[PDB]
Amino acid sequence: VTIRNAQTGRLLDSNYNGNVYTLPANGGNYQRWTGPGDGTVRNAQTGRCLDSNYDGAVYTLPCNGGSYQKWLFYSNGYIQNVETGRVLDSNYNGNVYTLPANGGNYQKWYTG
Ligand SMILES: OC[C@H]1O[C@H](O[C@H]2[C@@H](O)[C@H](O)[C@@H](CO)O[C@@H]2O)[C@@H](O)[C@@H](O)[C@@H]1O
Ligand SMILES: OC[C@H]1O[C@H](O[C@H]2[C@@H](O)[C@H](O)[C@@H](CO)O[C@@H]2O)[C@@H](O)[C@@H](O)[C@@H]1O
Ligand SMILES: OC[C@H]1O[C@H](O[C@H]2[C@@H](O)[C@H](O)[C@@H](CO)O[C@@H]2O)[C@@H](O)[C@@H](O)[C@@H]1O
Ligand SMILES: [K+]
Ligand SMILES: [K+]
Ligand SMILES: [K+]
């Protein structure tokens, strides 16, 4: 289902172009996500895998088995990219990107 930023209240969102962003909850399936158990976080509408790189950019692409598309969900709300180690982040404008863990609330996420 949904992934909601702890700082901004905006939810994790993505489209068929593979662009990612956050928006207020709006019921659409672009805002729900599925975790099979293989490390991936797949968009409920598109089936694509949330993914990022060493530059900090974050997008979705069809799923390819790479550590890049594998995420770790900690109980403190961090969502960590296995390859880079950088943590999923966003800003009130609805930018999504990754940055070094810095303890910030913009790096926390309620996932249900
Ligand atoms: O009208 C389409 C779409 O609008 C809203 O979706 C937005 C966003 O959440 C989706 O990620 C993108 C996908 O390109 O479209 C909008 O910006 C929701 O109402 C959604 O359910 C709906 O189909
Ligand atoms: O060979 C690099 C990388 O390729 C594939 O991952 C794609 C994408 O998911 C990644 O975010 C970017 C990283 O720059 O790379 C591709 O576009 C996977 O085959 C992956 O295992 C591999 O490391
Ligand atoms: O000092 C602002 C901000 O800095 C640190 O957060 C960084 C990053 O995680 C955020 O997404 C962006 C949002 O604009 O800001 C920094 O780049 C954190 O220490 C944070 O608590 C603080 O508000
Ligand atoms: K779209
Ligand atoms: K900090
Ligand atoms: K602050």
Author numbering: 49 to 160
Publication excerpt:
Similarly, we have independently discovered a new lectin, actinohivin (hereafter designated AH), from an actinomycete, Longispora albida K97-0003T, which possesses a potent specific anti-HIV activity. This lectin inhibits the entry of various HIV-1 and HIV-­2 strains into susceptible cells, as well as T-­cell-tropic and macrophage-tropic syncytium formation, through binding to HMTGs of the HIV envelope glycoprotein gp120. Previous research suggested that the small lectin AH composed of 114 residues binds to three HMTGs at the D1 chain α(1–2)mannobiose (hereafter referred to as MB) moiety of the three branched chains of HMTG. The molecular structure of AH is composed of three structural modules associated with a pseudo-threefold symmetry based on tandem repeats in the sequence.
In the present study, we have successfully determined the crystal structure of AH in complex with MB. Therefore, it is considered that the three AH rotamers generated by ±120° rotation around the molecular pseudo-rotation axis are packed randomly in the unit cell according to the P212121 symmetry and that the whole crystal exhibits an apparent space group P213 as an averaged structure. The three MB molecules, each of which adopts a bracket-shaped conformation stabilized through two weak C—H⋯O hydrogen bonds, are separately bound in the three pockets, which are similar to each other in accordance with the molecular pseudo-threefold symmetry generated from the three tandem repeats in the amino-acid sequence. Asp91 forms double hydrogen bonds to Man2, in which one of the two carboxyl O atoms accepts the hydroxyl group attached to the C3 atom of Man2 (O⋯O distance of 2.5 Å) and another O atom accepts the hydroxyl group at the C4 atom of the same Man2 (O⋯O distance of 2.7 Å). In addition, the O3 atom of Man2 accepts the carbamoyl amide N atom of Asn104 (N⋯O distance of 2.9 Å) and the O4 atom accepts the hydroxyl group of Tyr99 (O⋯O distance of 2.8 Å). The methyl group of Leu101 faces the C3 atom of Man2 to block its movement, so that the hydroxyl group attached to the C1 atom in the axial configuration protrudes into the outside in an upwards direction.
